[PDB]
Design a protein around this ligand. Sequence first.
Ligand SMILES: NC(=O)c1ccc[n+]([C@@H]2O[C@H](COP(=O)([O-])OP(=O)(O)OC[C@H]3O[C@@H](n4cnc5c(N)ncnc54)[C@H](O)[C@@H]3O)[C@@H](O)[C@H]2O)c1
Ligand SMILES: NC(=O)c1ccc[n+]([C@@H]2O[C@H](COP(=O)([O-])OP(=O)(O)OC[C@H]3O[C@@H](n4cnc5c(N)ncnc54)[C@H](O)[C@@H]3O)[C@@H](O)[C@H]2O)c1
Ligand SMILES: NC(=O)c1ccc[n+]([C@@H]2O[C@H](COP(=O)([O-])OP(=O)(O)OC[C@H]3O[C@@H](n4cnc5c(N)ncnc54)[C@H](O)[C@@H]3O)[C@@H](O)[C@H]2O)c1
Ligand SMILES: NC(=O)c1ccc[n+]([C@@H]2O[C@H](COP(=O)([O-])OP(=O)(O)OC[C@H]3O[C@@H](n4cnc5c(N)ncnc54)[C@H](O)[C@@H]3O)[C@@H](O)[C@H]2O)c1
Ligand SMILES: O=C(O)CCC(O)(O)C(=O)O
Ligand SMILES: O=C(O)CCC(O)(O)C(=O)O
Ligand SMILES: O=C(O)CCC(O)(O)C(=O)O
Ligand SMILES: O=C(O)CCC(O)(O)C(=O)O
Ligand SMILES: [Ca+2]
Ligand SMILES: [Ca+2]
Ligand SMILES: [Ca+2]
Ligand SMILES: [Ca+2]
Ligand code: NA
Ligand code: NA
Lengths: 412, 412, 413, 412
Amino acid sequence: AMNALAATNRNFRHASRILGLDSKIERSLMIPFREIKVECTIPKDDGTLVSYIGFRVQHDNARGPMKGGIRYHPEVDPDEVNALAQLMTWKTAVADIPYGGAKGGIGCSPRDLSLSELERLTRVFTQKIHDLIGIHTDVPAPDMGTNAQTMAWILDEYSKFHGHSPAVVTGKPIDLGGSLGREAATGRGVVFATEALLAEYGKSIQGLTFVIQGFGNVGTWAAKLIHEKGGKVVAVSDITGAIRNPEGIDINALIKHKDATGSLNDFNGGDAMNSDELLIHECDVLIPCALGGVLNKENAGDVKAKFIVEAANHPTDPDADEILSKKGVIILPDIYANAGGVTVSYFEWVQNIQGFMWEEEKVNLELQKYMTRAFHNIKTMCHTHSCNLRMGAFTLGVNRVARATQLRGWEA
Amino acid sequence: AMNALAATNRNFRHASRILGLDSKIERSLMIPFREIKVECTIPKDDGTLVSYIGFRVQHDNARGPMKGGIRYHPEVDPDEVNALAQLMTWKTAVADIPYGGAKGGIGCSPRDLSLSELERLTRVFTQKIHDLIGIHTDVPAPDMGTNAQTMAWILDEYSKFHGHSPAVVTGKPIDLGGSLGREAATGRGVVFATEALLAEYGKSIQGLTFVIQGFGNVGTWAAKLIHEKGGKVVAVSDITGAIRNPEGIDINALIKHKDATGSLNDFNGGDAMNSDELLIHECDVLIPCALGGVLNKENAGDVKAKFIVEAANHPTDPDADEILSKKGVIILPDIYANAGGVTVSYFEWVQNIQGFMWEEEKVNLELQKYMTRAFHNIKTMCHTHSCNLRMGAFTLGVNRVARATQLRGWEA
Amino acid sequence: NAMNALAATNRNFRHASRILGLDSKIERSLMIPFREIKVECTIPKDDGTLVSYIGFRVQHDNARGPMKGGIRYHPEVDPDEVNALAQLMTWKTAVADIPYGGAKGGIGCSPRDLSLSELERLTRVFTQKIHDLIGIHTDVPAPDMGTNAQTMAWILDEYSKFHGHSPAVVTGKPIDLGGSLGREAATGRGVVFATEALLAEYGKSIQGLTFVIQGFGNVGTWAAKLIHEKGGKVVAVSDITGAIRNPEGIDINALIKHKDATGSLNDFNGGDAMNSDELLIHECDVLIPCALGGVLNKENAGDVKAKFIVEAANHPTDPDADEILSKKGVIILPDIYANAGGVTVSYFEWVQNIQGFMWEEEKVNLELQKYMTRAFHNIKTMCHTHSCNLRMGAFTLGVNRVARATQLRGWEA
Amino acid sequence: AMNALAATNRNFRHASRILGLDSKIERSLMIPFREIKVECTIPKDDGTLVSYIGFRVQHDNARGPMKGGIRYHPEVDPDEVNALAQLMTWKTAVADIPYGGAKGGIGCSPRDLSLSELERLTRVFTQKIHDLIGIHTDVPAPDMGTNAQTMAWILDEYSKFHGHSPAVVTGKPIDLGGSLGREAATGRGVVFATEALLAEYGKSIQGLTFVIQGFGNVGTWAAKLIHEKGGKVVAVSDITGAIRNPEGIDINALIKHKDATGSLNDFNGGDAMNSDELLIHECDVLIPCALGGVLNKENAGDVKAKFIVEAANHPTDPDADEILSKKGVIILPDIYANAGGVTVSYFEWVQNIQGFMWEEEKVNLELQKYMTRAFHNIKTMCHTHSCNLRMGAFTLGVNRVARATQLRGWEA
Ligand SMILES: NC(=O)c1ccc[n+]([C@@H]2O[C@H](COP(=O)([O-])OP(=O)(O)OC[C@H]3O[C@@H](n4cnc5c(N)ncnc54)[C@H](O)[C@@H]3O)[C@@H](O)[C@H]2O)c1
Ligand SMILES: NC(=O)c1ccc[n+]([C@@H]2O[C@H](COP(=O)([O-])OP(=O)(O)OC[C@H]3O[C@@H](n4cnc5c(N)ncnc54)[C@H](O)[C@@H]3O)[C@@H](O)[C@H]2O)c1
Ligand SMILES: NC(=O)c1ccc[n+]([C@@H]2O[C@H](COP(=O)([O-])OP(=O)(O)OC[C@H]3O[C@@H](n4cnc5c(N)ncnc54)[C@H](O)[C@@H]3O)[C@@H](O)[C@H]2O)c1
Ligand SMILES: NC(=O)c1ccc[n+]([C@@H]2O[C@H](COP(=O)([O-])OP(=O)(O)OC[C@H]3O[C@@H](n4cnc5c(N)ncnc54)[C@H](O)[C@@H]3O)[C@@H](O)[C@H]2O)c1
Ligand SMILES: O=C(O)CCC(O)(O)C(=O)O
Ligand SMILES: O=C(O)CCC(O)(O)C(=O)O
Ligand SMILES: O=C(O)CCC(O)(O)C(=O)O
Ligand SMILES: O=C(O)CCC(O)(O)C(=O)O
Ligand SMILES: [Ca+2]
Ligand SMILES: [Ca+2]
Ligand SMILES: [Ca+2]
Ligand SMILES: [Ca+2]
Ligand code: NA
Ligand code: NA
């Protein structure tokens, strides 16, 4: 259970060492451009007040407007938001999209708030950060605990202060300027990333078994698209519980059952298992799709997967990376594998600022090209620097940010 | 040495209980409106880069634009800036000036920077916070390690972004719209505060002995104006050392000597003394004028003063308060005694927005009037609530802030 | 016959710089204006045909505060003149110890040749072209030659379309639109105060002395009227139409009525026509130029008969004339002091506007007197410190104050 | 050498008389929209101050945002900037790109300034004009003495005041939103223009001899691309000297030599020649790529070229035009032949505001289309008005600006 920012800074310092970065540049790159904490106090439906703290860490904007989602989750805190924001900086650079990195969140439990309370909280948070975000400054998006409806409320409230600004947030509903393909983009990108990786070993998804932790926006689309590529999704978990079927779970039936009952439990097409054995389940490919830090020094040694594809942000800490590398496990890093979301967010933003939307086929074709080119550039760094996939992506992104920073200069 | 924010929060909660504040209002008043941390990187004179982190905590704005200084000191960190900012909210309310509270700082050692480096650092910090401050939003000022020249640079840089804005900062040089009386205002207010307290016992400054920790903007003017009221300043210290004379130090001579040599303890008109027994020196009145938290559980039992007048922000922690109370020591609290600075800053801001400067005698007569009225209001709270001077001031300030907050309301 | 106005003003500035011992880099920075702006101003005439003018606003220096200075409509407006006038505003505001820097603007046009509707359109288009450059705490215009309170009303009205009601963006306004009591008369009244201050140093006063006035507009009429009411004998007056003299003194109130009724000073029953180019060399105790700059120059200065010159116009005496006149024993009270009653009461008008509350005229004129008395005292101090004449006493006072503010602001980016 | 603005105004008045332009419209089109001169004072690396005067002439914006580069050169003065700005107005209209004309510069010698000094000067200039330029107002670019790195500093400083604004300047580094093709664009467009001209005579570049004055952004690319189309570049000069080779200079070798030594002198593949006989050197096509006014009444009669293609701005004054016309020399005018720079600048601006960059193949294909179309419209004007190439282009541009001006109207 390592501190999230300590783990991410360890990876950053490793990448900086591989690159030979100057120490003063390295320090500047670590320090976020701006960290914001704001009081967010709303009346509950019964009129009583509740106060939350909202966060937006704006890590780096050398390569363009900052980009990253907003997490509503009880474990949101400054270290977590800082770690996620720094990862967005490297992720956007690896994807070669013209963004820097940011992240925000509120430490709350959304399932304990009514829809009207969530809307008020979202609008108050927007009132408290509207002057610090913007189409060409910092563009939020969903993350854990938020979704396209959350984004609609941000858009609606932001637009009161600045006029109609569809490009100020991505992950919007289609009817409010959202992009076709954005809902499925992170899971679909995970599929593309997994296919690029497996192809290096002469393999494809068909017939392989997959274990998925988390069953939300990322986990459901990754599970559904892997299954439709012929993969055997043999175990899935979420906050409610876990299920397994060694012949592969009928993911579409699982989605129906989850929507209808609110639970993975009592699914007819699988067996209840202990959630805390999900990550060490037998499989070809393990895909964490929920919280970070879940693969650590305590359980990494029990991981049975041959490949790990990080759909979640920072699911594997650096202690686990070492334990797993010794076990022969290949790890496709978060800052590449889950970048389908922010890549299609970039396409959404482009569509909005161009005032004209794309067909879904074009969105998904561009997503594939970007994921293919990013993986190609990662492999080049891995070869240049004789390093593993995580450090190939991390050095790629750090190097691109350092270049843009140096071009912009340092005089006042 | 107790954590500064923990110490201030202990005092705040006690005050809230005295007032019977609802627990949700109590929590809201603790949480700052907005906390900002920004990277401040400059080239040094030799061209090499140095990176600092700048802070501005905007604690509360219910009563008006936020107000508070900018500290350049190596121990600046988020807990310190948050504690100072919260104290500004109570202090402005105690003074009955139409401001809320804020504070900023950079963790740096100004003596280690050249004048050109300090100017670049000040201008970059201003570039990083200009969108967060403003004449009717948040109005900075000096504190430890900054002075009127610093404020000139903030004014000059801010005005590039928003046009000429003299009232955006106070403590300015007279020639750029500063107020007569502001340089001396905190020390002069300390004198008025001390006179008010002493008169409750039939006493005057004339003939009493005083010990002063620190010899900067606050300590020099407190010592000089006490001396000119006939007080005997028997010991003085600063970062370089300490000097004592039980007959009274010639403060004007000491000021000349300090300016000529940069040190205190080789002064002809006194004897060197160990700086670490200054606070426990025999005196009628002890006036800390340097860092916070210097009267604590380790040394409070050895304090020999009959009265403590808090010129520094939070020089006495709550452990020390309890120890000193049992010894019969009477403590005039920071949020009253040092409020001359922010009160004359209010007058400076008024003069700027009115476009027309006042004579110094008007500034100082208004300062006296405000300090006499605030002391009376503190005494009223002390009598109503049967509480000590610190809690009289804290409850006065918190109550005023809570009242403004409740009038503004909570709907979105 | 005149020196170039900017060369003349820079020669005075360089001399003041030398007296003060200014560093050469600071000297150069203080010469260079903050910002010079030239804009096309094209309007339809009443018959629909187009006419194009060039408008100027030179923002010379803002170290001491919002820039301040009038707008001139006159055929001889050009960049050198506007730059010279703007630089003089910087020193004048500093001499007066008001919290402003210096700017000036203008249009090279002949207002007499435009209809009122054409003048209004031109003024509104000029405002449209510079509204983003000026502002209550940035640059605050005012009248000058060829413009008046009605001109300022149109600037206010057009500017407020872009920025909301902004009374303090311009001074010299009509009283009924936020103007200050006392501003119409302020420059002439300040000229009297300044003259009284100077004469008192010689144990004299206005009563019984003789005065010659060149120009009979906002400045010249009020200087002449108020001098006359203090017992001065105004023995010659000119404007663009002609010149009249009466060695026993002209009835200024009668002359005002005659000029109003006929549009001319000529054929006034209470004086004698004279050659307008002998006006400045007429016998008198005190000569007060109240029209164009550079009118005392190499060609006529040696024939000046006045004992005192009080500069109500901006830069009426060039440095060649200064030197000639100094050898003749003529004492010259400089424009950047003597005519500062206008900008001083403009400051008061601006204060009243931003404060939302207007003053009585008695308060305005009492404050004007205080400011003019204090400024003269400070000029005398500089004269004594630097062993220099009145012009250099004022110039060094202003330059020193601007340099001090500049140094405090600093130079890093 | 004639006055630059007098020469350009003479060409403008000539074009207006060909068009029968209304005399009032003519006068308005001559008068620039807005001329700006600003103080630019910086500390040097040793801390001493230096003051420059920065200029931005915004000549005409009837057809759209104004466009034109920034020159750092000791001969920069108001007449030169006014002349270049008026030429940008006609050039943009000839190219049929939706821009008006502007130009800027600072009278300085960049080679006498350090890189940090150049950066501070550039940033201060930007501070002084940021309120007067903008994506839809006035978009600068490089010119003599500035380059992509200069533009990066303008972008960076401007974005402090207005947020990230990549389209505010063109000629940016690729890694900061620059366009592929922009660096080579002016020289490449010179090639296209020359090819369109020569084709009118059944000629092409291959085999012909060229002389080039200047060897910077424009001269190096023009010479390189001409040589790669089989042209014989027989003489080249820059500020350091001149070389000739009647069999053709190896331009790639000359570039490498120039880079390594900083001089064209002592190039192993050419002979020194007197650089003030470069323009009168025997050749088929003469291409000035440096200062304006270099062909004048004194040397035009000695010109030996058959064609002059004006890559520099206003290299030929009207006295020379007449002398050369009598000699049968054909002159392809600057406002057409060098328009590849601004045309690809337009594509860069488009890419930036669209948030999505183009392939270089597309950039260069569009450049060719635009240059071919502009030449066709110039020939149409030459035939309609029985005038030479300069007046065909000048009348095309003036007529397009006059039309847009008339549509906008004149009431307040
Ligand atoms: N949404 C995106 O576009 C996107 C993009 C890239 C990366 N990510 C990352 O993907 C991960 C999932 O995000 P999401 O958008 O799917 O969130 P979501 O809120 O839609 O779903 C989160 C899922 O995780 C489950 N979960 C929560 N705690 C769990 C626990 N302790 N054990 C097991 N399951 C648990 C929830 O029940 C739910 O199934 C996060 O790390 C997020 O930062 C999201
Ligand atoms: N300046 C104001 O208007 C103002 C207003 C209210 C309260 N305060 C408080 O007053 C105190 C002093 O502020 P200032 O403006 O005088 O600062 P300053 O920087 O002008 O001077 C600080 C002084 O403290 C001394 N000092 C520092 N560390 C010391 C140590 N360990 N022991 C002894 N002396 C030490 C320095 O040597 C110097 O004499 C601070 O708590 C500040 O927050 C300042
Ligand atoms: N108005 C102010 O508040 C103010 C303030 C300070 C200084 N000034 C200066 O005072 C002078 C006059 O300004 P004003 O406001 O009275 O202008 P105005 O337009 O009201 O009047 C100008 C006067 O000068 C006369 N004049 C013009 N050319 C002349 C010539 N060749 N010979 C003789 N007389 C001539 C006109 O006929 C008219 O009488 C100018 O130098 C101006 O810059 C004006
Ligand atoms: N850069 C563009 O995109 C662009 C676009 C259109 C037109 N132009 C025009 O092209 C010309 C060159 O611009 P650039 O971008 O190549 O500039 P640059 O600074 O990159 O290079 C200028 C070149 O001219 C040479 N030079 C200077 N003075 C000279 C002299 N007296 N004799 C001979 N050579 C001399 C320099 O040594 C250098 O080789 C200028 O007229 C410019 O306005 C530039
Ligand atoms: O779409 C975006 O802007 C961000 C997507 C994400 O923030 O969830 C992420 O990549 O972690
Ligand atoms: O004058 C001000 O606004 C600042 C006062 C201060 O921050 O130094 C303080 O009261 O601690
Ligand atoms: O009142 C003003 O602001 C300006 C007065 C004036 O510009 O005419 C001047 O002093 O020359
Ligand atoms: O690319 C631009 O916008 C301008 C190109 C240039 O200014 O150098 C020119 O055409 O002269
Ligand atoms: Ca950073
Ligand atoms: Ca609060
Ligand atoms: Ca200047
Ligand atoms: Ca025009
Ligand atoms: Na009409
Ligand atoms: Na240096």
